[PDB]
């Protein structure tokens, strides 16, 4: 099927970096004043300290943080152990850190990094008394597990073969001690296959999980220091949480059944119920003491369940306001959760026998976390949460994503609060594609069903340029073809449109870079009867010459190597083919932001002052 931009798929055609290098410099032109005077208000909430792993041990709690321009990993209210400046200066480059673990005893730790934003990482593993590095490890390695003298990790193979000569992407697990390392589960399986371990909270025992897609988990256990003998207990036809094994008996969190996540156990190849399945989501659930820890997410924000192991619930614990919470890790005795939302960039929580505050980061100001329902076409309620300052302009810059299991929960973004402060109004919609309300929900929006996402988001937009409001629609990646199908489909509920990193041409998706991986979620292009649902919504085919489009930005960059530029270029393409208020920003600094902020944090400066420019 020919394309007339075809040639855009190749990012070195001196066309391709004619264009990205005139609508730069346009764009720069466009916000640059603007963008230059918001940045310092924008690097205050973008660059302000962040915690992102933290970990338990006998010694205390290790944390990561972001501040500014470092990152580093260190005792919790104690020393640092790793630091991303020193990091810099030794290897003379700029680094990325990944994550981290430790042993249960506090005195080994593992951490990852990558060198001047390489494809690839670098493992390291340090005393963390003395500080010296035991051992570095290049590619980087996931999932350590430490045990005796060495430990489980897997590896993740994504340009090479596995050993056992199998092609990628693949998993392999692996023990490494002092006599070596050997490949000790995960041989023959084909491409698609993905592993992790964990411990039993005891110690006692693997806990393998396996995973091929959203259609197949398998869960094995076996002594811990003995995968001769780790056998398979669960079989199921999605992917499924191992969360603990404890006096004989295996606890599960599965989306089986309807959808929405329940615990089961099973215990000699008999499955019992713990905790059927509610009226909203399990989303995690963890053991601690004698004790379940779930995670329910009502209506897209988190309360907290506490159970008997035997499923009768204890207590309940909710927020006071709308959050994201996420368990870190636990111990025996405790376990640490994240919790996180518009206006708190985080909370770091324990819980043992009940939930205790031990560190938090909020933005000051009379911000008000609202929450309500647009209706959609075919009658189902959207959620949406609201946010807003003590001012009230009447502008609302609009957030969506829908789709690939992935719920909106409340998060913290840094670019907002200036644009709260300015009278702004920030809008989350909840829609279908996502897992806020299950399987059912995610499937409601995936193939022939991917029309009900945009249907979704229009009813929100509508709802809210009825109610007075400016509106400015932004979504990435798959949010990216959120906002772009809907002002193809509804120029007329958005006054502004932002489409960051997008996914456009539906026809070539599988053709680059990842994109084939999308198939389950979109449908296959190269089947007529996919074909005729994807060109019902594709943007690229899309493009109506009869009506008026609101100002529009397409975002990405150039060395992305997840969401293919090219989608961007050719909408971009499409769009000045008619004569539309379009502006392209590529951004060409390498590597991403998780220590290199200054790139980012301008990246989304320059957004906030499209919003703020385009609604005026
Ligand atoms: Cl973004
Ligand atoms: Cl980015």
């Given at each position: ?456 988001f229009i009813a929100v937009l509508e709802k809210l340029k009825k109610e007075g409001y400016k509106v400015a629609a932004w979504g990435r990646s798959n949010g990216g073809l959120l906002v772009s199908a809907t002002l193809t489909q509804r120029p007329d509920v958005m006054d502004s449109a932002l489409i960051g990193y997008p996914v456009i041409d539906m026809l070539r998706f599988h053709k680059l870079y990842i994109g084939s991986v999308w198939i389950p979620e979109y449908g296959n292009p190269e089947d007529p009867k996919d074909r005729e649902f994807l060109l019902k919504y594709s943007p690229y085919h899309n493009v109506d010459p009869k009506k008026k489009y609101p100002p529009t930005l397409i975002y990405t960059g150039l060395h992305d190597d997840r969401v293919h530029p ?51």
């Amino acid at each position: 099927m020919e394309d007339p931009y075809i040639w855009m798929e190749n990012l070195e055609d001196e066309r391709v970096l004619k264009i990205i290098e005139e609508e730069n410099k346009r764009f720069r032109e466009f916000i640059g004043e603007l963008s230059d005077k918001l940045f310092p208000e924008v690097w205050e909430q973008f660059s302000q300290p962040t915690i992102g792993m933290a970990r338990i041990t006998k010694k205390g709690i290790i944390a990561s943080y972001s501040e500014k321009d470092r990152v580093v990993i260190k005792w919790f209210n104690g020393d640092v152990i790793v630091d991303s400046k020193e990091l810099e200066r030794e290897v003379g480059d700029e680094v990325l850190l990944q994550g981290f673990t430790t042993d249960e005893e506090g005195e080994k730790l593992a951490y990852s990094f990558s060198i001047g934003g390489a494809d690839e990482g670098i493992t390291r593993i340090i005393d963390l008394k003395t500080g010296e590095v035991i051992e570095e490890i290049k590619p980087s390695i996931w999932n350590i597990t430490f045990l005796k003298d060495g430990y489980y990790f897997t590896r993740f193979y994504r340009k090479e073969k596995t050993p056992d000569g199998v092609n990628p992407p693949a998993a392999r697990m692996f023990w490494k001690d002092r006599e070596g390392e050997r490949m000790v589960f995960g041989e023959g399986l084909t491409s698609g296959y993905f592993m992790s371990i964990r411990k039993s909270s005891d110690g006692k025992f693997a806990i393998v999980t396996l995973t091929y897609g959203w259609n197949q988990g398998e869960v094995y256990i076996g002594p811990i220091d003995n995968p001769q003998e780790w056998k398979k207990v669960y079989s199921a036809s999605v992917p499924v949480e191992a969360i603990d094994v404890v006096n004989g008996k295996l606890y599960i969190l599965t989306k089986e059944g309807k959808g929405l996540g329940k615990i089961i156990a099973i215990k000699n190849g008999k499955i019992d119920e713990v905790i059927p399945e509610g009226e909203f989501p399990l989303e995690w659930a963890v053991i601690v003491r004698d004790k379940i820890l779930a995670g329910r997410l009502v209506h897209a924000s988190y309360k907290l369940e506490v159970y008997t192991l035997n499923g009768e619930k204890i207590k309940e614990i909710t927020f006071d306001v709308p959050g994201s919470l996420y368990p870190l890790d636990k111990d025996e005795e405790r376990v640490l959760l994240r919790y996180t939302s518009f206006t708190i960039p985080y909370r770091l929580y324990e819980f043992k026998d009940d939930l205790r505050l031990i560190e938090e980061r909020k933005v000051e100001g009379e911000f008000r976390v609202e929450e309500d329902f647009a209706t959609s076409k075919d009658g189902t309620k959207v959620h949406y949460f609201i946010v807003k300052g003590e001012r009230d302009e009447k502008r609302a810059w609009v957030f969506g994503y829908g789709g690939f299991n992935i719920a909106l929960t409340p998060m913290f973004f840094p670019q907002v609060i200036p644009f709260l402060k300015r009278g702004g109004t920030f809008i989350m919609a909840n829609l279908r594609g996502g897992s806020e309300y299950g399987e059912e929900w995610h499937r409601a929006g995936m193939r022939e069903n991917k029309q009900n996402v945009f249907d979704d988001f229009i009813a929100v937009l509508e709802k809210l340029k009825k109610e007075g409001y400016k509106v400015a629609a932004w979504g990435r990646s798959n949010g990216g073809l959120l906002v772009s199908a809907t002002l193809t489909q509804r120029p007329d509920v958005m006054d502004s449109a932002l489409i960051g990193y997008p996914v456009i041409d539906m026809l070539r998706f599988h053709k680059l870079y990842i994109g084939s991986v999308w198939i389950p979620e979109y449908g296959n292009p190269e089947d007529p009867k996919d074909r005729e649902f994807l060109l019902k919504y594709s943007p690229y085919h899309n493009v109506d010459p009869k009506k008026k489009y609101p100002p529009t930005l397409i975002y990405t960059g150039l060395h992305d190597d997840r969401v293919h530029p090219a989608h961007a270029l050719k909408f971009f393409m499409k769009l000045k083919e008619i004569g539309a208020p379009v502006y392209l920003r590529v951004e060409t600094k390498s590597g991403h932001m998780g220590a290199s902020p200054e790139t980012r944090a301008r990246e989304l400066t320059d957004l906030l002052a499209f919003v703020l420019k385009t609604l005026s």
